[PDB]
Subunit: 776 residues, 3 copies
């Protein structure tokens, strides 16, 4: 119940409109919390909710304390954070709920309260730079001897999600520019409405301006300096939404002296927060306390909006410090790094000059960290260009104990735009330029191929089918990239279709041995847990439906017991082929497989340098071999207006079209093909509840992949799974935090011994090293 | 010298030895063997003050073994805290001084102070040392001791606990004076017996040390329990009462 | 079927005599190939062979090429080699078949062909120095983590067999005189007639001279320069055996100046081949192309002869470059070595000055290898002597990243020379001379024992009894060698005899804990494979039979089920003993047991400084217990002319003398003895096709040791198994290939998971360093 007093939109609204002149808020805060609980956790019964709230009220009462943000922080601090060997750590039994709590509330206010109200032993120096971890000897030594490995680690943004809020305070005006740009589309309009339906761009600037000005006020309190005596002129928090105050009709700003030069840094915040709570150890004024409550509500609300929004001015905020800070953050505390092989996903750009700036800035950041850590003679003291960075980077020897980097651009997809005879045409011409821009950069300086080791495509699956990238990835292959990871988008309209998309990537795309497939939730989720909280009937596009049935018949024709579904799949598929292709003559199910087997051919080669070499590469195979009707259908399948009209139409598909065993049969059938190619699979963080079908982490599909007998199914051919922290869904995240999360749930929920619990997860961690993209 | 003296001596008596001289060597071995029999049996002032700093160096060399690389990587050598604050400070310096010179011969790198002669300069030389896995990592752990229960004073251990309360302050104030020693003073132990005092006696002593930055606590469960069922309860007392976190150790859990 | 089309003696003979004027050789190349297909592989049906030839021709017509190496190399290169991240890598499915091909055809033309037609991506530079390996991320990770461990690497010769061709070209007469001197032996006469009956010393010189002249004339074509017009007389290729053409009384020397300074390196030849094939992408002239076809034929013929022959000035042509190249090749194409603990065996030489230079040269080359890789201040810059090299190498610590070395001399033996109290007498004095030479050099420099660690005896088995090395090894033990390995020869007339030979080595030789054994094929092979294609009766010396029969009785008296064979052994032994010993008064089986137990005693000492110390030791132990019946018999068993004639007689023993389980019981008895003594088994290379009993590598006996179900019979005792790339049987050899060759079979031929297969071979690789002779 503590989270609902720190991250709640409705409670924020009521406090913001209440002036400070009256502090009769005991009933107002209570009623909003119940509503706030109602809009976050619907299923929680009311009788339990009222019972839990009453305990918290008396828990504050028996503490000779008043209800406030300081009061909430205290009960949270003594509940979750306990001092241990490495300073302040987290209780192992209570770590599962802590990760859920970080999905709603930031950790910096919480750590400040614990340090002030329960300091670390011997007053030893402690500065917050990493998220809190629970200490376990079994796993800690594994970190010491074998560093962690990270695969899906994006570079845009910052080290974590919280300090981006600090970067938001750096340029509040720039925040509107990016907020307005997204808000123009209706997709972001509903996304913001989901968190705050009463949200407008002007209101957003108010809260950002309100939060900054509250921070200035409370920083004055922490400084020990007397307030500027405009407190009598201040009664409404809304007065802080314009960065100006009046005193007898006089213009007075909010500027104040900071002994810490970088007032917009995480170090400044923790230093400010600790001093604030120390001065409020026994009693705090009601007026000042509510300002702290508002600031906490603003910070937790914006970050709640930010994590959803992530899945111009902000891009060019610093562009070099974040890259350096990321590697220092990824290194971890201590002399020796906790991460050995860390590969990054950087956003490609359509400007060749901007590309040179992007690669230089990140490579300069990588060299800066290595120079700071490893004192070793450098050819150039200041490289100032990519050529000289490679001169510095070619000197260093890989000894493992420092972070090894392998940049991998991630191609981005867009909505299927009509026209040009096939729905993904502006996409392909844009993607073709992006690849070509990287091509000339690589061929100009071949030494760059030691760091640009792979290519990724992580936007969606509905927006763009996998087979569109077959001409793209293969033409990258002739440039010496030699690694292609495909991040399948898990927004499948049907689970069978989701498995169908996985098979397309394997068969069509050039997933050579050693490559990876990220976010393979479809081939991981349990069919029994997918059906929950779903309507009796689903809906998906006819083209998806037709490709689904053909794919079903490809894997269900082999099974003797699961045969009646394949025969019915063939019967229904040809009937849809009659409706979709609008063909008059006879059509056979065998021809459908043959036609769709050709889908890996290029976009323009269906009508038939590196690209022109690839052009006739798939054109010759079409002409030489005998069949022509599959080409005629494939040509019709691509560039026929009626076919395009029919494909976009939606159809009604029963939820239980394939029974539980049959879906498992498909899920295991693709697994065998998955393991044959020896393709590793990136795993999203467990706390990332994007799918939202998992009510608790204990039923996450990663447990079934690892082979836990409580969750594994018969016929499950083992896979190889690698970890990754890409879209955590929580404000304070790190790989080591996720590593502990895997260990805690296995130790507590499953009862596995600590020695064995590490062993099962160590296999997952080491697989990132087995299938690394870094050169030997 | 003893080995060199004996090897040359045994060569001279390869075929025969004079009867009187041979018996003297026989007598010498019995005296040495009997003394060593008593010495190791004592456990179950001037002895350690011959040089008090060179013997600690010799311990690491013996622990290191032959070859360039030591066969033991981690080594936490327990030592007895001293009731004199100055004497303990000199005792702690000698162990660290002996440790650094062992690194000096083994390592090949610069030193901040060529002649440390004090704990402050030793720590400066020691912080520059990075353990690469071949040398011996050292972590001093003072181990306490007990005696028979002191009759009276409202409970059996009030005069005994007073010395332990003093000894912790002897360790603590020096630790507070030089907080840089936290990385080498890591654990606290108490290895005398069980009948001397129950394990819960150290609960206040461990908690104050824990909150003052020791960060580790090992307890030596002595195996002199009057009955086997009694010995199990002594282990239960340590677990239920002592503040043992996840990563603490127990010695001789034979019971 | 391309193997027969690039290595076939009859085709090369027919191409040599037939002039360059004919263009249609299909009527003869087809007849020659089918004939050559017979003798090389006489186990293929004619119709299948006939169909394969037609398909090969039909595939050429598909690519409208002309029948020749440019056509043949294209098909082979595209079928096997695939471009990958590290360059050209063999396909995993085709690796097993590739290794069989490698035993007969060099990969240098194949890799050169692939580089020309489908080169490396992004114009990345590919330097051809190492043989191709298949790429698997699982195995690659482990080998980079824990480097490969090698045990049996012969220092003599160059890195691989391919450049011994290059040396042979560089030494037209030195390799001729080595062949000419070896031609006198009748054994070499049979071997040379085996590969080709028309092989005479003159014929050998003609073909080498032909290859030298063909290489130069094609080099001129490769460089682009026009031909020097002497081709007017170029009709019969046989003219190329005179080093000078005749054209209007003009002497034309075929030698031309190469652009590269050295004309006898792999890079020199590979770059030449790429230039040659590049100009012949479309078509080639028949006269020049046939010259290339001819050139490949002598190369393939001689390389097949060289590797089969293994069943001086040339060795010491450089004596510092060859070993450095050997160390460089063993290091691998990387900064850190692929092979950590490499044991370089070398042949000891009786001449002190000759071998003193050799020992310094290999140490200097090893030191030169470390200096090139690792840089620091050395004790001396130009050692020029054995003492300064050792002082230089004392500074280098074992770091693992480079190659660690430990020389182990392997004694070479001769045929048994009758006389002087024992049949191997002139040998023993030569070996005693060799040991004394080795001992005094250890006195010259005590540090030599740091690198001189083991002693080996690898020539054969039937010639030298294993007990003969008891006095040789023991004196070396007191000399501070501190390790010994015995390499039993696999020429055992009977499988039971092979078991006895390993038993004799364990009993008598001072093989203490940690010592190794080599080529222990006798115990590994199952009886079913051994009897394949053997005659129903086998012949062996009466000396061997008596030793085996008593051995059978010693290890079968315990087993209740196979008890009659133990009794049959005793009765047959005493019956045979009366024939051999020619004794009137009967001899018990127990008396025979003690007679053969005294085989360890020195023959000279039994007939009666360190040599006299051991001489009296055998005499002393004899007189401690007064048996006086066996000792008198043993004296007769060694120094009786009538007995020595009887022991040399051959006796016919049935092939199935003992049942399959009886041999199994005998084997597991030895498997028990190796467990107690903890003796390793450095297995010979898996591609070494010399046992000729396995129809494929799938039936290699090593898998029985590994414990795979379906190959490990019940009752077997686990061993410790090392690896050695000593006698690969293939052209381009490395331990890296062997590790992948084993990995492929378990993953593919045995259906094991990649995680499982790596673990089993990791246990084998680890044993290569658990029992390594390198000092701690």
């Amino acid at each position: 119940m503590e989270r609902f007093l720190l991250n709640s939109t409705v409670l924020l609204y009521r406090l913001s409109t209440v002036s400070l002149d009256e502090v009769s808020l005991d009933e107002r805060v209570e009623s909003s919390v119940f509503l706030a609980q109602y809009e976050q956790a619907r299923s929680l019964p009311d009788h339990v909710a009222k019972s839990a709230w009453s305990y918290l009220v008396q828990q504050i009462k028996q503490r000779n304390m008043k209800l406030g943000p300081v009061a909430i922080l205290r009960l949270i601090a003594e509940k979750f954070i306990k001092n241990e060997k490495g300073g302040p750590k987290i209780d192992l039994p209570m770590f599962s709920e802590w990760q859920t709590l970080m999905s709603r509330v930031s950790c910096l206010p919480i750590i400040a309260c614990h340090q002030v109200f329960n300091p670390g032993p011997a007053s030893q120096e402690y500065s917050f730079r990493w998220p809190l971890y629970p200490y376990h000897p079994t796993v800690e030594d594994y970190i010491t001897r074998e560093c962690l490995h990270e695969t899906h680690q994006h570079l845009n943004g910052s080290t974590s999600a919280e300090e981006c809020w600090l970067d938001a305070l750096k340029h509040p005006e720039a925040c509107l520019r990016d907020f307005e740009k997204g808000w123009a589309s209706q997709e972001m309009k509903q996304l913001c409405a989901q968190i705050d339906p009463s949200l407008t761009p002007r209101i957003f600037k108010d809260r950002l301006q309100i939060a900054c000005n509250i921070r200035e006020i409370l920083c004055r309190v922490a400084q020990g300096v007397e307030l500027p005596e405009w407190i009598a002129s201040m009664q409404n928090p809304q007065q802080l939404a314009n960065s100006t105050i009046l005193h007898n009709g006089r213009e007075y700003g909010f500027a104040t002296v900071w002994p810490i030069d970088d007032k917009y840094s995480q170090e400044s915040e923790f230093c400010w927060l600790t001093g604030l709570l120390e001065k409020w150890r026994f009693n705090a004024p009601e007026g000042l306390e509510r300002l702290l409550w508002i600031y906490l509500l603003i910070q937790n609300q914006y970050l709640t909006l930010l994590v959803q929004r992530d899945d111009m001015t902000e891009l060019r905020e610093e562009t070099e410090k974040s890259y350096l800070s990321r590697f220092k953050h990824a290194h971890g505390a201590g002399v020796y790094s906790q991460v050995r092989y860390l590969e990054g996903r950087f956003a490609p750009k359509s400007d060749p000059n901007k590309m040179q700036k992007l690669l230089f800035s990140v490579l300069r950041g990588y060299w800066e960290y290595l120079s700071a850590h490893m004192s070793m003679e450098w050819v150039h003291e200041k490289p100032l260009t990519i050529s000289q960075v490679l001169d510095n980077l070619e000197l260093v020897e890989p000894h493992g104990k420092c972070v090894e980097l392998a940049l991998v651009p991630h191609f981005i997809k867009r909505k299927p735009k009509n026209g040009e005879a096939y729905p993904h045409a502006l996409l392909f011409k844009d993607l073709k330029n992006q690849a070509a821009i990287l091509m000339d950069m690589l061929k100009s300086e071949p030494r760059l191929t030691g760091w640009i080791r792979g290519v990724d495509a992580a936007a969606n699956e509905m927006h763009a089918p996998p087979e569109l990238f077959c001409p793209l990835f293969r033409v990258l292959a002739k440039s010496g990239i030699a690694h292609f990871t495909y991040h399948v988008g898990e927004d499948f309209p049907h689970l069978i279709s989701g498995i169908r998309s996985i098979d397309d990537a394997l068969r069509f795309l050039p997933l050579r041995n050693g490559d990876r497939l990220g976010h393979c939730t479809a081939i991981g989720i349990t069919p029994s847990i997918w059906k929950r909280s779903l309507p009796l009937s689903l809906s998906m596009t006819k083209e998806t439906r037709l490709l689904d049935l053909v794919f079903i018949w490809r894997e269900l024709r082999s099974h003797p017991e699961l045969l009646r579904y394949a025969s019915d799949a063939a019967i229904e598929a040809v009937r849809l082929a009659h409706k979709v292709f609008s063909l008059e003559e006879e059509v056979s199910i065998t021809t459908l497989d043959q036609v769709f087997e050709m889908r890996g051919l290029l976009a323009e080669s269906e009508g038939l340098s590196l690209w022109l070499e690839e052009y006739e590469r798939a054109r010759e195979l079409v002409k030489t071999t005998g069949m022509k009707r599959p080409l005629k259908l494939y040509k019709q399948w691509l560039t026929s207006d009626n076919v395009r009209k029919q494909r976009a139409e939606y159809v009604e598909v029963a939820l239980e079209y394939l029974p539980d065993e049959a879906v498992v049969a498909l899920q295991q059938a693709v697994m065998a093909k998955m393991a044959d190619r020896n393709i590793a699979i990136e795993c999203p963080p467990t706390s990332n509840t994007r799918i939202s079908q998992y009510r608790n982490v204990s039923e996450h599909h990663i447990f079934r992949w690892m082979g836990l007998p409580g969750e594994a199914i018969e016929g499950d051919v083992p896979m190889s799974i690698c970890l990754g922290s890409d879209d955590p869904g929580i404000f304070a995240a790190d790989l080591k935090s996720e590593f502990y999360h895997l260990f805690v749930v296995l130790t507590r929920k499953f009862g596995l011994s600590p020695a064995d619990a590490l062993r099962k997860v160590a296999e997952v961690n080491e697989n990132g090293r087995i299938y690394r993209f870094h050169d030997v």
